Subunit: 101 residues, 2 copies
């Protein structure tokens, strides 16, 4: 089956008492950045990848344009990069440390 | 204000690549067999109860037929018992340790 359809069909039959937990989970999945202890050292990363935000920032700082970053990592979107850049803006000390270490 | 319609909105906005993950999560949510640290000391239990799988297996192993379990614990369904027996079949060592004194 088509995946979007498969999920609609499941969600349409879901017990009402599970709606809140399902919503909370999918809302979490909407964030392109993920932090997971014991994955990439617990560092913030692009969701379901082994690409830490700081490595993207480091490659940019060393002169990689966005076209090169996206071309290198083929599941990566513009929104992922934009989210990485926003994460850096909100967490500059942490990321600058990761780059230095 | 309607969390069900909000859930519909968020699933429709989900990238293709995350749909399976969400499917698996929801299957876990609906599974008659639940495992979480804060209920039954992290032992496998029947959804919406504090009845561990191990207690149902112990009763079955002493000869309690399904109909007795269902009469005794009117919250349980046949799907719940069937799922308990499948869980035991898949995790026999774990359950047996829970039955044992310790």
């Amino acid at each position: 089956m088509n995946k979007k359809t498969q999920l609609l069909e499941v969600i349409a039959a879901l017990p009402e008492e599970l709606v809140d937990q399902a919503l909370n989970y999918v809302q979490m999945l909407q964030n392109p950045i993920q932090i997971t202890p014991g994955v990439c050292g617990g560092q913030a990363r692009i969701r379901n990848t082994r690409i830490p935000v700081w490595t993207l920032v480091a490659y940019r700082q060393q002169g990689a344009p966005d076209k090169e970053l996206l071309a290198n990592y083929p599941g990566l979107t513009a929104e992922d990069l934009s989210a990485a850049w926003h994460y850096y803006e909100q967490n500059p000390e942490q990321i600058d440390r990761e780059i230095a270490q």
